[PDB]
Amino acid sequence: DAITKEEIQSISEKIYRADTNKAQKEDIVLNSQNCISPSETRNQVDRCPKPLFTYVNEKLFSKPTYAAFINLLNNYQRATGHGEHFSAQELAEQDAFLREIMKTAVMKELYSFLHHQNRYGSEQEFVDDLKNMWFGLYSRGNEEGDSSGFEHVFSGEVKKGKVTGFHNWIRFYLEEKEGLVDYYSHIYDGPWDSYPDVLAMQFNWDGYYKEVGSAFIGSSPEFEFALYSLCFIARPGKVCQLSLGGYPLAVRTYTWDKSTYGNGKKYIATAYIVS
Ligand SMILES: [Ca+2]
Ligand SMILES: [Ca+2]
Ligand SMILES: [Ca+2]
Ligand SMILES: [Ca+2]
Ligand SMILES: [Ca+2]
């Protein structure tokens, strides 16, 4: 069944209200500090001397979907050109993440919507497709299987001396805590006055610069995984107009176009919040 623009905006609001594992107001203290003009993002000047996350209540990271998500963030080599080889325990981490997110109201809402729209006949089929499109390996650089949709969006990569991808707040917080991310500034702070919020950030990640990295702030991993999958499944390759807490938010997805899985199906090249 065709998924309409109106149907996308209804399910995106259902996903937003169902996100009970999101950070509560008291679980994160943000310090956005200096905002610069979009014309100054190539300056590479650190205008924020304090970390972006002044405090995060790390008990949030004991929630099973956060623990399973964080367990995946040490499985990759950010520099493209280095093939990825997952251990049996690392493939079990992918299954554990998918099993944990499927227990949430967020993923139950998305699967129910997609099943009603006749895109998937079963949860098993849907989980298998998600595992392929997100965790399947493809080649961005010098070696085979150095990248994936999940690595690009959630872990972040370095290609040709610049940061590429890197759109997740938990990954940002954990690297910043280790001194591996240095927050420089933002150009945009979304209309939400609660979590999830959106910030468009400039930052240095262990020697490489990210010019405009838009990220949800305070969302659970299942919220982000559901919305990015919704945009990719319903509108692959296009800008999908979501509605979140009554405010519009546009997301771009692109298919990977150098390889396929199964019967000519596409891996996710990227999913991101547009400027
Ligand atoms: Ca429909
Ligand atoms: Ca791991
Ligand atoms: Ca990699
Ligand atoms: Ca700084
Ligand atoms: Ca805001």
Numbering used by the authors: 134 to 408
Structure paper excerpt:
The endoribonuclease EndoU-like (Endoribonucleases specific for Uridylate) superfamily (IPR037227) is a poorly understood group of RNases found in bacteria, eukaryotes and viruses. Human EndoU (hEndoU) was first identified as human placental protein 11 (PP11) due to its prevalence in the placenta. EndoU showed little dependence on Na+ or K+ and sustained activity across pH 4–8. These results indicate EndoU is a calcium-activated ribonuclease targeting a large repertoire of RNAs. Our structural analysis revealed a calcium-stabilized interaction network involving residues from both the eukaryote-specific N-terminal extension and the catalytic core of EndoU, ultimately leading to the activation of the catalytic triad.
To elucidate the effect of calcium, we crystallized EndoU with an excess of calcium and solved its structure at 1.7 Å resolution. The structure revealed five calcium ions, with one aiding crystal packing and four potentially activating the protein. Each calcium ion is coordinated by seven oxygen atoms from acidic side-chains, backbone carbonyl groups, or protein-stabilized water molecules. Sites (1) and include residues from both the catalytic core and the eukaryote-specific N-terminal extension, with site (1) located 12.8 Å away from the catalytic triad (H285, H300, K343). Comparing apo-XendoU, apo-EndoU, and calcium-activated EndoU structures revealed conformational changes upon calcium binding that mainly cluster nearby protein loops. The side-chain of E290, located midway between site (1) and the catalytic triad, flips to engage with a water molecule in the calcium coordination network. This correlates with the side-chain rotation of catalytic H285, then locked by an electrostatic interaction with E290. The bonding correlates with a disorder-to-order transition in the loop carrying E290, forming a β-hairpin and stabilizing the catalytic site. Our data show a model for the calcium-dependent regulation of EndoU through allostery, with site (1) and residue E290 as key mediators in the intramolecular signaling leading to EndoU activation. Therefore, our work supports a model where calcium is not directly involved in catalysis but rather activates the catalytic His-His-Lys triad through allostery.
